[PDB]
Amino acid sequence: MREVISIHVGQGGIQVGNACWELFCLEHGIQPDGQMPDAFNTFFSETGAGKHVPRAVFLDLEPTVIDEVRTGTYRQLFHPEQLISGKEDAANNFARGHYTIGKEIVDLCLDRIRKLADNCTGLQGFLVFNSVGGGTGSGLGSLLLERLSVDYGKKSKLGFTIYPSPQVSTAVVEPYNSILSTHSLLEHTDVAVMLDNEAIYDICRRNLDIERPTYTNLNRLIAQVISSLTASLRFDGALNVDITEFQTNLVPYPRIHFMLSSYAPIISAEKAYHEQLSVAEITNSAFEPANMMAKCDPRHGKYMACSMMYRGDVVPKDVNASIATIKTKRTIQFVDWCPTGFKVGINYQPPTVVPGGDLAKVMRAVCMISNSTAIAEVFSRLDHKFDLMYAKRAFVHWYVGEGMEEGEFSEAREDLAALEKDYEEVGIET
Amino acid sequence: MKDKESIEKTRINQRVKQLLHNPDPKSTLFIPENQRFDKDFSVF
Amino acid sequence: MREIVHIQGGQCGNQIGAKFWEVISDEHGIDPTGTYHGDSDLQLERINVYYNEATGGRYVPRAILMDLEPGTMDSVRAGPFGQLFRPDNFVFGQTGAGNNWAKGHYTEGAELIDSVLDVVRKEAEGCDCLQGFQITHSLGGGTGSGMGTLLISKVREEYPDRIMETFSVVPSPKVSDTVVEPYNATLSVHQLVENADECMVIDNEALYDICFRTLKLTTPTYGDLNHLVSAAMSGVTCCLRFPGQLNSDLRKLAVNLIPFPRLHFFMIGFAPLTSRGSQQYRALTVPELTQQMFDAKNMMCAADPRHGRYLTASALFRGRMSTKEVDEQMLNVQNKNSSYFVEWIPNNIKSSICDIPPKGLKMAVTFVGNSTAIQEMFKRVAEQFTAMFRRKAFLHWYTGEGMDEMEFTEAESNMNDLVSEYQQYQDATA
Amino acid sequence: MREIVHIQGGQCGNQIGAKFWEVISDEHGIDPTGTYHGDSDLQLERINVYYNEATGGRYVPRAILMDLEPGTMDSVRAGPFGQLFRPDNFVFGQTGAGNNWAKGHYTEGAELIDSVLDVVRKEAEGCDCLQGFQITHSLGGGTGSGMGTLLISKVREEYPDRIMETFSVVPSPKVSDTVVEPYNATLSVHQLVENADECMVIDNEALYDICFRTLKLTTPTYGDLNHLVSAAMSGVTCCLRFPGQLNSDLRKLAVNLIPFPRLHFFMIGFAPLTSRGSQQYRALTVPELTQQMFDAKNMMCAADPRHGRYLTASALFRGRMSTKEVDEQMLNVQNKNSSYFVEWIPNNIKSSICDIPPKGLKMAVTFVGNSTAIQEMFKRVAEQFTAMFRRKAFLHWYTGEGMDEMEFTEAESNMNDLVSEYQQYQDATA
Ligand SMILES: Nc1nc2c(ncn2[C@@H]2O[C@H](COP(=O)(O)OP(=O)(O)OP(=O)(O)O)[C@@H](O)[C@H]2O)c(=O)[nH]1
Ligand SMILES: Nc1nc2c(ncn2[C@@H]2O[C@H](COP(=O)(O)OP(=O)(O)O)[C@@H](O)[C@H]2O)c(=O)[nH]1
Ligand SMILES: Nc1nc2c(ncn2[C@@H]2O[C@H](COP(=O)(O)OP(=O)(O)O)[C@@H](O)[C@H]2O)c(=O)[nH]1
Ligand SMILES: [Mg+2]
């Protein structure tokens, strides 16, 4: 009687949704056709006899990815008319997907959301995935969040956004729409998790020893993180954690809800079994700055609160004996007004392996969600990138001619300045 | 594993409609014609 | 007992009947040769409602077919199940009306109607206990809209206490096939309100919209529209031919759906309707039936039901199901939509349950709701009528056969008065 | 969906199209008889982009061919794949322009253009969702440079929101085949900047240089230059016809490569290009592709790209490859050449990946970069124009058909203003 609905918008969102939906189907024993040859209820729904239907909706204005989905092996799984598709792409223009073509599509998506919500009885909250540096992704994510915040109100929404890397970039105009989308979801999303690609590339290179990774390898790690986060809702555990038990433990103030994640262990089968993978060493590896899932240095800032999930055969006393060691270290310092900052969850189900993938099978794993003061650097560098081109009003004509006003750029800049001032104000000791 | 590059190699390797009266046998909707007449919700 | 006779006129009515009788015969297991080959005992208990008995054990419908030209009845005889109709009931003229209402109501229709009234009187005087008559005709044609409506008055004059049904197709301005449609539509609506006990409007535009959007079939034809209309027609009298938890004849619906004697124009809809490819995805449940039943696009008329407030509503469930669920769902569909239900009449939804579902389906619902949104059709019909009449266009054809403009003025005034007094109750408050 | 129509004018444009359509047909496996004989399923999924469907299962390009003389179209019909073109789309006059811009834009081109605009309107109104138009023509000829540019304005006036492409061959002073080239080049550049959404300059001199130095073939012909131009043309829209990791339609490139609405003159290049004898020596890797892609001699224009600074750049990779390598190589090509990239817009390189390589090649790259080095071409064109105009040489031919010297003065002034304001941003600093 506990449910959650995941929203996938944009090319990156759909490509990570595919990645998480192989993993969930594999973890619950459901074949790609949707047929089994009481834990499924969190992500799926029973049709009365036979197949299961995911509680997910796919959105995009550009039809190529959806058409690829509707012809692959998973054509029989998803309901045919929840893969909403458009005709014309926003083409990396934020104003397009927020004012011009997204408005005519958003009504169908909201109707689908209502039709899925009326089925659930114990709706925990929503999940949303969107790559920020694109037109349709950021614009439609903003519009959907704004509609949901007023249609439903206090229901919790979680956002797994992928911000651009510090120096590596695929587009040339992504700072503009990244800043605008951050403006939009700052006052509209309860949790936002950092996911830039460069850090995960470094993780793959160093640990998985892959020298030529593709997007699928990144999306599989993201899917594993999602599964670790939501395992506690569908498996028995000695110390459970619910989604609604987050803003009471990781969010000191309503404005501050951007945090960065990490995962451990990450190791290949060729050298995994030569070492014992004790809980102490994995919880040490999870706190290593080089294993952050976002390219930010935690040594440059304080910690505010750490929520970290275990799964497997871990014993609570071993967890406490390792939290003490971390509190001992002099290179990791917490904020003054937080004496204890750890929330611990323990689950029994070990992580599942996907055949043909990178990760091996292990009995212990740890996933941490940590809120730290050091996150302000990404905001500062994105702001610096934005200012350089906004000084000469470059690329603005592509946005003014799509219905957006001239002054809309300035207030996003002011909100980022306010956020950066707030992060500095919080981190000073009393 | 003794200095394997096979994993690197594998990546290289990859390089007037009548549907109302005729719902599919698979579907939930289809009630057999022969059984069309049990009229009791109670016993069932 | 309590049986009804079938009378149809015009080409459109004949084509509707040619599928209605096929549907009825398939429901009762009657072969196109008139021989029973059914499986269940209940298939024969109440066969006297629509079929007569003759020597040799075969069954013959008590239908009367009339038209001013012989082509349509000479064509329907060669179709499937065309041999069931008694050759004696075929009455036709040698001239036709040419879509001229005056010719089919004053000059030609007056002389011929004596022969068809003779067989109508023969059929009604003989039957065990009369329940009433049901009429299928089109308002877009001359001979139909003239002779049928004059026959309505002639029947009403002789059987004032029996009930009278009319399934009327009104010409929509979107799909127009005749230029003189407004004249004979407006003239017919004038006479139809004075004599018909019940009227059910059906539009070709709404049928095309339904076929294109819900069934999603590529090439609609008149056979599909006729099949939908036939299923809707059969759904109304199902509980009069089969046992059920709450039997409800036509007179009981007449009592509960008509508040005032001049407000008897309903719009209907049938559920469930699903595409061939999605018939396996869906699960048939009472919530699924009731959510599609009140859907605006599911109505058999282009009138938008959320542009007005329902005076009353009716539902005729089919199949074996629990009554508690039906009642609670009816209450829920009325609590969540209180703005679209008139407030000075509480509990304005009628429900009925029949234990015999349609052949091939486990559950089905027929919806008959009296709403104030029907005013829009008369508004546009009168708008076209007054746009064409102000120049006296095509008026000489009508005035050359004894008709005058005074009967046009009276018809327009009465139709406008009906439009006004139908919406008078929409703004009424307690 | 999101398809485009092809329009070509003049002899040079017709010869370019005669190879572009051959390349497209060979890519999609269409025989010269219009019958599909391909191998892969993906070859037919998005064939509606360029080809229409007719009875009998054959395919016909949606191309429109126009010229002021019938010889070139009477010759292209007898060539290979010449039967695909619909005979109705052939429109021609009986007089010709004689390389006189005035005749092809004021006197003769004005009367004929109604017929070609009729078929253009027929083609655009019909198609599912329009993406835009692409235009191939030469600036060195009269009828082409006149009628094509006037048609550009006529199309823009009727479809202001669609996108417009132009592949324009400008007359180089090295290989000159017409003495009156500067006049109709300068007159055409004036109109082309006001209406074309994108423009891509191509020079015969650069094509000869490439053929002589990189391919090292002894005797270049127009067939080789046409083949190179056709490969470059096909490379731009590849991801719009095939799936990929990051799809990017033409509008997305328009957003990311044009900073200001008047700076839309790009120069392109195709990689890899290797000689027949060295095609076995080389190994196709991403570094090998990217080192040849930014090579100065590889540009399709004689303009030297290390004489200026890139405002932005784009790359469209083809084939299956890792994205991490592409991003790191793009970063490396931008860190080692920081002097040639403008500093007030960071991360000014766009990348895209398509999983379907060209037939016969495993990897390919199309490069589209907006650079300030293009000023040199307009400088020399204007230099020749002002050297010839000061004596009023050959001016009477133009002035005898209603044109005056004032339109020459305005064109020269606007072209010089464009030259100045294009380099204005080269010296701009943050
Ligand atoms: N982690 C990850 N990021 C991706 C992936 N695909 C695209 N991105 C990121 O998404 C950004 C651009 O947005 P996209 O998702 O590609 O495109 P979009 O969101 O659909 O927006 P449009 O361009 O209008 O279609 C790029 O900067 C990429 O970094 C992916 O598969 N995995
Ligand atoms: N549903 C349905 N409607 C029809 C059919 N044939 C004609 N119509 C409708 O009937 C209208 C014309 O009526 P008409 O044939 O002139 O009636 P008549 O004058 O009595 O013969 C058209 O607008 C059609 O929409 C049919 O086979 N099925
Ligand atoms: N690439 C290519 N260029 C050509 C070809 N034929 C002519 N040209 C170029 O076109 C220019 C002459 O253009 P012209 O034929 O007068 O154009 P028109 O006036 O529209 O017919 C010359 O400078 C040539 O360089 C060809 O087959 N291929
Ligand atoms: Mg996209």
mmCIF file with all atom_site columns, C-alpha atoms and ligand atoms in Angstrom, chain D residues 10-12 15-16 99 138 141-144 177 181 204 222 226, ligand 3:
data_model
loop_
_atom_site.group_PDB
_atom_site.id
_atom_site.type_symbol
_atom_site.label_atom_id
_atom_site.label_alt_id
_atom_site.label_comp_id
_atom_site.label_asym_id
_atom_site.label_entity_id
_atom_site.label_seq_id
_atom_site.pdbx_PDB_ins_code
_atom_site.Cartn_x
_atom_site.Cartn_y
_atom_site.Cartn_z
_atom_site.occupancy
_atom_site.B_iso_or_equiv
_atom_site.pdbx_formal_charge
_atom_site.auth_seq_id
_atom_site.auth_comp_id
_atom_site.auth_asym_id
_atom_site.auth_atom_id
_atom_site.pdbx_PDB_model_num
ATOM   1  C CA  . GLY D 1 10  ? 20.650 27.250 -61.719 1.00 0.00 ? 10  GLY D CA  1
ATOM   2  C CA  . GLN D 1 11  ? 23.063 24.902 -63.427 1.00 0.00 ? 11  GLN D CA  1
ATOM   3  C CA  . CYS D 1 12  ? 25.467 24.612 -60.486 1.00 0.00 ? 12  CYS D CA  1
ATOM   4  C CA  . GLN D 1 15  ? 24.529 19.545 -60.704 1.00 0.00 ? 15  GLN D CA  1
ATOM   5  C CA  . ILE D 1 16  ? 24.947 19.584 -56.907 1.00 0.00 ? 16  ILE D CA  1
ATOM   6  C CA  . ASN D 1 99  ? 24.635 35.678 -66.243 1.00 0.00 ? 99  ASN D CA  1
ATOM   7  C CA  . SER D 1 138 ? 25.596 29.555 -57.033 1.00 0.00 ? 138 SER D CA  1
ATOM   8  C CA  . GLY D 1 141 ? 25.643 33.107 -62.121 1.00 0.00 ? 141 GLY D CA  1
ATOM   9  C CA  . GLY D 1 142 ? 22.847 35.479 -63.076 1.00 0.00 ? 142 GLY D CA  1
ATOM   10 C CA  . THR D 1 143 ? 19.675 33.399 -63.151 1.00 0.00 ? 143 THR D CA  1
ATOM   11 C CA  . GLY D 1 144 ? 20.647 31.397 -60.071 1.00 0.00 ? 144 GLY D CA  1
ATOM   12 C CA  . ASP D 1 177 ? 35.031 31.667 -65.132 1.00 0.00 ? 177 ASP D CA  1
ATOM   13 C CA  . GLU D 1 181 ? 30.976 37.646 -61.085 1.00 0.00 ? 181 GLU D CA  1
ATOM   14 C CA  . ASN D 1 204 ? 35.671 25.693 -56.053 1.00 0.00 ? 204 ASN D CA  1
ATOM   15 C CA  . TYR D 1 222 ? 33.158 18.376 -61.219 1.00 0.00 ? 222 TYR D CA  1
ATOM   16 C CA  . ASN D 1 226 ? 29.950 17.466 -56.250 1.00 0.00 ? 226 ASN D CA  1
HETATM 17 N N1  . LIG E 2 .   ? 30.744 22.057 -58.103 1.00 0.00 ? 3   LIG E N1  1
HETATM 18 C C1  . LIG E 2 .   ? 30.346 22.378 -59.358 1.00 0.00 ? 3   LIG E C1  1
HETATM 19 N N2  . LIG E 2 .   ? 30.402 23.678 -59.746 1.00 0.00 ? 3   LIG E N2  1
HETATM 20 C C2  . LIG E 2 .   ? 30.017 24.051 -60.989 1.00 0.00 ? 3   LIG E C2  1
HETATM 21 C C3  . LIG E 2 .   ? 29.535 23.020 -61.915 1.00 0.00 ? 3   LIG E C3  1
HETATM 22 N N3  . LIG E 2 .   ? 29.221 23.643 -63.063 1.00 0.00 ? 3   LIG E N3  1
HETATM 23 C C4  . LIG E 2 .   ? 29.479 24.962 -62.885 1.00 0.00 ? 3   LIG E C4  1
HETATM 24 N N4  . LIG E 2 .   ? 29.955 25.206 -61.653 1.00 0.00 ? 3   LIG E N4  1
HETATM 25 C C5  . LIG E 2 .   ? 30.337 26.536 -61.124 1.00 0.00 ? 3   LIG E C5  1
HETATM 26 O O1  . LIG E 2 .   ? 29.303 27.478 -61.415 1.00 0.00 ? 3   LIG E O1  1
HETATM 27 C C6  . LIG E 2 .   ? 29.853 28.709 -61.890 1.00 0.00 ? 3   LIG E C6  1
HETATM 28 C C7  . LIG E 2 .   ? 29.007 29.205 -63.054 1.00 0.00 ? 3   LIG E C7  1
HETATM 29 O O2  . LIG E 2 .   ? 27.642 29.257 -62.647 1.00 0.00 ? 3   LIG E O2  1
HETATM 30 P P1  . LIG E 2 .   ? 26.462 29.270 -63.739 1.00 0.00 ? 3   LIG E P1  1
HETATM 31 O O3  . LIG E 2 .   ? 26.443 27.971 -64.505 1.00 0.00 ? 3   LIG E O3  1
HETATM 32 O O4  . LIG E 2 .   ? 26.612 30.439 -64.684 1.00 0.00 ? 3   LIG E O4  1
HETATM 33 O O5  . LIG E 2 .   ? 25.127 29.423 -62.853 1.00 0.00 ? 3   LIG E O5  1
HETATM 34 P P2  . LIG E 2 .   ? 23.727 29.809 -63.558 1.00 0.00 ? 3   LIG E P2  1
HETATM 35 O O6  . LIG E 2 .   ? 23.820 31.203 -64.125 1.00 0.00 ? 3   LIG E O6  1
HETATM 36 O O7  . LIG E 2 .   ? 22.624 29.761 -62.532 1.00 0.00 ? 3   LIG E O7  1
HETATM 37 O O8  . LIG E 2 .   ? 23.436 28.830 -64.668 1.00 0.00 ? 3   LIG E O8  1
HETATM 38 C C8  . LIG E 2 .   ? 31.284 28.422 -62.317 1.00 0.00 ? 3   LIG E C8  1
HETATM 39 O O9  . LIG E 2 .   ? 32.170 29.375 -61.722 1.00 0.00 ? 3   LIG E O9  1
HETATM 40 C C9  . LIG E 2 .   ? 31.600 27.029 -61.811 1.00 0.00 ? 3   LIG E C9  1
HETATM 41 O O10 . LIG E 2 .   ? 32.679 27.082 -60.877 1.00 0.00 ? 3   LIG E O10 1
HETATM 42 C C10 . LIG E 2 .   ? 29.502 21.623 -61.417 1.00 0.00 ? 3   LIG E C10 1
HETATM 43 O O11 . LIG E 2 .   ? 29.105 20.688 -62.147 1.00 0.00 ? 3   LIG E O11 1
HETATM 44 N N5  . LIG E 2 .   ? 29.912 21.396 -60.167 1.00 0.00 ? 3   LIG E N5  1
#
